[PDB]
């Protein structure tokens, strides 16, 4: 993943 | 147990995730029963999950499990509490003493941890206070010169404004920096289809501001979220 969680 | 790992860039639920925390988050699982002779994966109320955003499902959001399936939520934005009946008997909720936080918020706006003997210009301290939903305890953050406009917020067919009750497999999802989180109030309930996982640690953690780059470090911050 690595993705963003805003 | 599958397990996704995520940045977080925004400040939405300090003071328990900083901005430039990396995150380990366990995915929930569809349980794997035997009928002939794992349990089914469900946010407990306090849990922090990860889900997709309802109205644009290509943005993942991070925010805290209030309100389950049944449950009416009611906020008061004067006192910025909480009060919550399960299946609708009251929840047992409470919250300590407001005290100074590590942290100001500028005003965009950034955040920095200032030490609470210093001031900084152009700036409010936050208050920092502990509340209990139940059997959980975490922080919230709470800015002093902020109050929500109930009219701005998602209104429940049915429902008073800043009262909500959670439809059957929804979730209402609030963030612990609460005067700084675009949340449930504002945009509704989130479907189960749309959890994702529930945050178990911090991995990494980099020092930095919203869009800055990272200043340092912060290793002091992996471990368990609390």
New interface residues.
Partial sequence: XX???? | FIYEAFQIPSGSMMPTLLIGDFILVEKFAYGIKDPIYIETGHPKRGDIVVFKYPEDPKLDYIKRAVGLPGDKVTYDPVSKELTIQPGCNALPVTYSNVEPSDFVQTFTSGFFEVPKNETKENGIRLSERKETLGDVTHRILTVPIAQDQVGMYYQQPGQQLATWIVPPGQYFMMGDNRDNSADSRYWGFVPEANLVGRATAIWMSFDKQEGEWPTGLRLSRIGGIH
């Fill in positions: 993705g963003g969680a805003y």
